[PDB]
Amino acid sequence: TPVLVILLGVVGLSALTGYLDYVLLPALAIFIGLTIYAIQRKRQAD
């Protein structure tokens, strides 16, 4: 069920809903990139 993967990622976005400048390392921006990339791949692998 590739749809379940999108549901889990959707919940993570809810916990994070506020802007934020960039400090020494945007660990948050990278975390989302890996989260969205993994969800798109699991949902479908081309």
Side-chain angles (χ1 to χ4, degrees):
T1 29
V3 174
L4 210 306
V5 172
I6 298 173
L7 297 183
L8 183 72
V10 171
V11 174
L13 184 72
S14 193
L16 184 73
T17 185
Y19 77 91
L20 184 72
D21 293 346
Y22 302 99
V23 212
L24 272 296
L25 249 156
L28 185 71
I30 302 310
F31 186 84
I32 299 306
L34 210 306
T35 302
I36 297 173
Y37 274 53
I39 291 165
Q40 186 185 64
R41 184 180 69 207
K42 295 294 189 85
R43 183 179 72 141
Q44 194 182 351
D46 201 15

